[PDB]
Design a protein around this ligand. Structure first.
Ligand SMILES: [Cl-]
Ligand code: NA
Ligand code: NA
Length: 210
């Protein structure tokens, strides 16, 4: 194969919840990879995020909150006992996270927060920033170097995506672009890299024969 094993499949976001549930988004649908083996059925976003966005451009989780971003709107859900939209959401992104100095963002491509950090990393185009989630809209975005010109989604977590990790100490840092899945051992490796790393294929991750 379905959209899953399609050569034109493009993912739009990745996120994992405080409980260990990992989701990969493709526009208006998603798949759940941390199942056990509950088919490879792709669900429409509303399946679990009843009142969320139509499509997801980026996603992250911090604490017991799961964030979904659509264009310039952010949706924040509590992961108490099922996802509940937070009162007052969604909100303009600048109202929640502030803004980079010289740019006015219209869309965001990827986001991630590594375990045991309150530092949100956000990417748009060939730019990558970090900001402190503890500072709300007053956050200062610091531009970091990296080797990517464009990404589709990102994810930082202790367990590996697929059978093998690329990090012995910290959590695995994953960036996706088109059919590729890249893994970095730490954010510093990401900032220091001059070439991209051998990618793994997303299709294989999605349970395809190739
Ligand atoms: Cl993302
Ligand atoms: Na994205
Ligand atoms: Na993400």
């Amino acid at each position: 194969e379905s959209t899953r094993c399609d050569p034109d499949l493009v993912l739009s976001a990745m996120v994992s919840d405080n409980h260990g549930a990992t989701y990969v988004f493709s526009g208006s649908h998603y798949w759940r990879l941390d199942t056990n083996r509950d088919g490879w059925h792709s669900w429409p976003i509303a399946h679990q995020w009843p009142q969320g966005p139509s499509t997801v451009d980026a996603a992250f989780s911090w604490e017991d909150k799961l964030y979904l971003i659509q264009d310039t709107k952010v949706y924040v859900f509590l992961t108490k006992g099922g996802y509940t939209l937070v009162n007052g959401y969604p909100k303009r992104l600048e109202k929640e996270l502030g803004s980079p100095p010289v740019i006015s963002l219209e869309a965001v491509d990827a986001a991630f927060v590594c375990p045991g950090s309150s530092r949100l990393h956000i990417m748009a185009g060939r730019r990558l920033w970090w900001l402190d989630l503890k500072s709300g809209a007053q956050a200062t975005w610091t531009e970091l170097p990296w080797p990517h010109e464009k990404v589709d989604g990102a994810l930082c977590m202790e367990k590996p995506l697929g059978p093998n990790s690329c990090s012995t100490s910290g959590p695995n840092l994953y960036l996706i672009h088109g059919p590729n899945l890249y893994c970095y051992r730490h954010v510093d490796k990401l900032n220091a890299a001059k070439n991209l790393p051998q990618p793994q294929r997303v299709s294989r991750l999605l349970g395809c024969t190739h």
